[PDB]
Amino acid sequence: SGPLKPEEHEDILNKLLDPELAQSERTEALQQLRVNYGSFVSEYNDLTKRNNLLQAELEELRAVVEQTERSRKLAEQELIETSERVQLLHSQNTSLINQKKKMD
Amino acid sequence: SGPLKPEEHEDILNKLLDPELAQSERTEALQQLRVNYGSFVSEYNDLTKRNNLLQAELEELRAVVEQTERSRKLAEQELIETSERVQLLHSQNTSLINQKKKMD
Numbered sequence: 001s002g003p004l005k006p007e008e009h010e011d012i013l014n015k016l017l018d019p020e021l022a023q024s025e026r027t028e029a030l031q032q033l034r035v036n037y038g039s040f041v042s043e044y045n046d047l048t049k050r051n052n053l054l055q056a057e058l059e060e061l062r063a064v065v066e067q068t069e070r071s072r073k074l075a076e077q078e079l080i081e082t083s084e085r086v087q088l089l090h091s092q093n094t095s096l097i098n099q100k101k102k103m104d
Numbered sequence: 105s106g107p108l109k110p111e112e113h114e115d116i117l118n119k120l121l122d123p124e125l126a127q128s129e130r131t132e133a134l135q136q137l138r139v140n141y142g143s144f145v146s147e148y149n150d151l152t153k154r155n156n157l158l159q160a161e162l163e164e165l166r167a168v169v170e171q172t173e174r175s176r177k178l179a180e181q182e183l184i185e186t187s188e189r190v191q192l193l194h195s196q197n198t199s200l201i202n203q204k205k206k207m208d
Contacts, residue, residue, distance in 0.1 A: 009141050013134045016120065023123055030117045033137065037113050044148055051155050058162035065165070068172040075179035082186050089193035096200040103207070 003040035009033075107144035113137075 004012075012029050015021070021029075108116075116133050119125070125133075 006141060006145055010138070013138055016134055017131065019127055019130065026123065027121065030120055034114070034117055037110060040144060040148075041110055044144075044151070047148070047151055047155060051151060051158070054155070054158040054162065058158065058165050061162050061165055061169070065169055065172060068169060068176060072172060072176035072179055075176055075183055079179055079183045079186060082183060082190060086186060086189050086193060089190060089197055093193055093196055093200065096197065096204065099207075100200065100203050103203075 003043055004036045009036070107147055108140045113140070 012032050015029050016026060116136050119133050120130060
């Protein structure tokens with residue numbers, strides 16, 4: 001499955017403490033460490049690759065923020081300009097009812 | 105420093121292959137594996153914690169996007185409403201020059 005839990009890694013080390021351990025049980029135990037350290041490095045590289053992957057997501061996602069704020073600041077700036085256009089037209093519309101009610 | 109490179113981990117395993125290895129050199133070698141597997145699990149947990157940390161950054165950063173798009177869609181919707189206000193005032197301003205040029 002996955003790399004050994006540290007207390008399981010200790011179970012192997014404990015077995016190798018015996019100096020009169022059979023070679024077959026010693027070399028089998030050393031292979032368990034060999035294999036497990038491989039799948040540990042493997043699962044660490046698969047995590048360290050998922051890591052600098054998320055680093056590319058938000059680094060691109062924050063660019064989306066800057067683009068959305070660009071669009072938003074434009075819409076507000078266009079709203080301010082068209083707002084000032086309403087003011088003028090309403091004040092021309094004001095200075096022109098000064099001619100319809102002026103007659104008679 | 106950090107966990108052992110796999111070829112350095114192999115250097116320890118190779119030493120333990122000797123059945124007539126001194127106990128002092130055997131138990132020293134097993135401690136190297138003991139310690140190194142600790143600092144490996146340590147550096148893996150410090151990476152797996154940096155991992156689900158970035159998971160909280162962009163998960164909160166995408167909420168900023170949704171808030172900025174909320175603000176942007178409001179500004180565009182307000183721009184459309186005030187734009188339609190300009191149209192009317194300009195068309196009232198049109199139907200009122202039909203009274204200033206109408207006189208004489």
